């Protein structure tokens, strides 16, 4: 098990209001 | 087990006002 | 287990007002 | 288990008004 | 165990109104 | 013309992370 | 004309993140 | 013409991470 | 024109971090 | 023309770290 930018982002982000996680292993995310 | 990199911001980001979390075991997260 | 760079900001950030987190091993996080 | 650069910040950041944290084990984060 | 630079700012910080913890075991940090 | 409580929360409210706005003359808003 | 308690908020507010105006005139409002 | 009380806060407020405002003439507020 | 009470906090405030403005006539607020 | 109390806190404040003004004719106020 090899893990590796999971959650990549090229370019800019205007704002970030939520949630940007990479990995879980629980759960119960409210956006 | 080799974790790297998890969430990735290549560019500039704008502002953050919610969670930006790179690995979680638990739960409950609200945005 | 070999954790690295878990959360990467390659340019700048504008401003945090959230939670940036890296590992978690709980819970209970309000954004 | 070998823990290093959990949260990258690899240019300068402009103002940091919530939370930034590297390693949690408890919970209760409000941001 | 072996915990090293577990939040890294390679370019300058404007300032710092907030919470920036490197590690913690306990909670309720409000930001 | 007599404006009175536009827009009302009798209750308590979690958060917000959009716009109210109680009286409008012009446009553009951007949700 | 009269403008009185636009907005109103009977309990408690939790946080604030985007924008609370009570009256404009102008326009371009970005949540 | 009579304001008053554009925007009202019965209860106390926890936190304030955007913009308040009780009246505006021009525009470009971004949240 | 009579302008009065234009942002209201009846209770305590916890918090402030954004912006609180009571009347503008320009704009480029950034929260 | 009469402006009175364009900003009011009828209970205590926690805390500022943002920027409290009563009263703007230019702009440019970054949060």
């Known amino acids: ?3 590796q930018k999971l959650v990549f982002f090229a370019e800019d982000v205007g704002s970030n209001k939520g949630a940007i996680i990479g990995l879980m292993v629980g759960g119960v ?3």
């Open 1 to 3: 098990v090899h893990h």
């Open 29 to 31: 995310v409210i956006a």
